[model samples]
Target: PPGTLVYTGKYREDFEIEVMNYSIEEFREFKTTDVESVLPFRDSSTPTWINITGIHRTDVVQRVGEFFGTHPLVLEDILNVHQRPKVEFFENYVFIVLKMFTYDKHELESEQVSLILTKNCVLMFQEKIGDVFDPVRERIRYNRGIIRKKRADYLLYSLIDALVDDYFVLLEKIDDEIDVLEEEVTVQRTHQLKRNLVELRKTIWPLREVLSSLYRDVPPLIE
Candidate 1:
């Protein structure tokens, strides 16, 4: 871990955020339906969130990246799925790689949720398909609050907020595991749960450092 060279991401275009003059609901209509059905596109809108639930299909991921002019490295980051939380600011956009912590019910491990927030839209990459952002999507769909009214910066904030909030959820999981291990620690203690606690703390502590430094480095253009 010592003497490692950390790299920030690069972008090809200067990112710009444009608020559509149209009503916010217009942007919310896009949704995921039967994959077998024909893919649909609304009239070319300036800012729309295309919610894709499944990621097993390489074509779907590639198409989404190509649609928004995402660079190949960004695509690779999205698919690779295990990078540390980082921020890369480009000319027109900022590439944010953050992990969403979810305590695996079976494995007691954490899940990573990667994201790319462009000027016009946001792309979310999850470890497993079929959501993890359903609540955020619902809010985006219903215009529940400022999410619809604000620009992509606000959307980025919302996404990050959800990711951080899940930390509490994971903490609760930690507590549950600890409670279970309270008795085991007295007897046998070489199972996965003990290792999970240690690994969770190790992984999470530096992640705090990674995130705070990222927050401090957020450039004005990010807003």
Candidate 2:
């Protein structure tokens, strides 16, 4: 009952604050929500990394926020779901919102993943469930990379960097898609061509603002 005091379901048990990275499978093992799986705090002797798998449930989200002592408005922002990617400074914690881009095979479209980072925790909220952070987790588990040795800042940086790097991948995909579109536009220009470009730009523009804001005056997650 004590454990349930903090978490509603058995999902809250068996959390491990690993040194490097924690995987989705690992998080699932702990019944961690898919949305908030986070890398263990690297610098801090003890850090909390929570991956929230579900966001459609408002009560769970609010309770989780309460568990972390997150501000009301902050939780409000989380619940809103349409928050613009941005960053805010506080005396105790820094709140960052970011959008992750992924090309969906089934939908033939891109989806956004929103992430929130704090002093020693990172929370990822997906449009659906599942993610693309597994490689980072593997590297950490095997000590194959510097992520394990670095602080939460570095881990957070890695997460952001991984996502930022994805922009190029998405861009290339778009360019190739555009080339295909170009070939087809001459013969059969469907509204889909225009729609994809609109989606691509929408992702690109806000990302710029998100990156700039984090750069202003924040610790780099390194010692």
Clash pairs, candidate 1, are: 13-92, 14-91, 14-92, 15-91, 15-92, 15-93, 100-113
Each candidate's lDDT (Cα)?
A: 0.56, 0.54
Candidate 1 Cα errors over 4 Å, as ranges? 1-27, 30-47, 102-106, 109-112, 183-186, 189-192, 209-223
Instruction: Supply candidate 2's per-residue lDDT for 120.
Output: 62
Error of 1 at 197 (Å): 2.3
**Alpha-carbon shift of residue 150 in model 2 (angstroms):** 1.1
Candidate 2 per-residue lDDT over residues 61-93, each given as its tens digit? 665566556776776665554567677876666
Deviation in angstroms for 67 in model 1? 3.0
Q: Write one digit per residue (lDDT tens) for candidate 1, span 12-111.
A: 1221111222236565342343432212222233444444433444455566666666786776676555576688987767887766543435454344
lDDT of 1 at 14: 21
The most accurate candidate by lDDT is 1
What's the true lDDT of residue 149 in model 1?
70
Error of 1 at 223 (Å): 18
